[PDB]
Amino acid sequence: AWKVSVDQDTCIGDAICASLCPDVFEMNDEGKAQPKVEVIEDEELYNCAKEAMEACPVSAITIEEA
């Protein structure tokens, strides 16, 4: 499966990630992105998550595969 993470230091609350993939990303109290789930198994959620990772203007998103 997959695992998504957002570097809370890099993120600038652009929110383009939560826009493209609202099922995977959400805004926290610090006004930064944050993974919605701790695991992605569905191939479509993986597709928009990777779509978000590609869109983040500060490259705060990474995706791990196990």
- Between CA 20 and CA 25 the distance in angstroms is 9
Burial category of 15 from C-beta neighbours within 10 Å (exposed 0-12, middle 13-18, buried 19 and up): middle
- Selection from ligand F3S, a copy of itself, none that 29 binds (CB < 5 to 8 A by kind) is none
Q: Is 21 annotated as a binding residue?
A: no
Of 15, 20, 37, 63, which one interacts with a copy of itself (CB under 8 A)? 63
Instruction: Return the residues of window 26-55 that contact a copy of itself according to CB under 8 A.
Output: 50, 53
The answer to whether residues 13 and 55 touch, using CB atoms and an 8 Å cutoff, is: no
Residues lying near a copy of itself in the complex (CB under 8 A): 50, 53, 59, 61-66
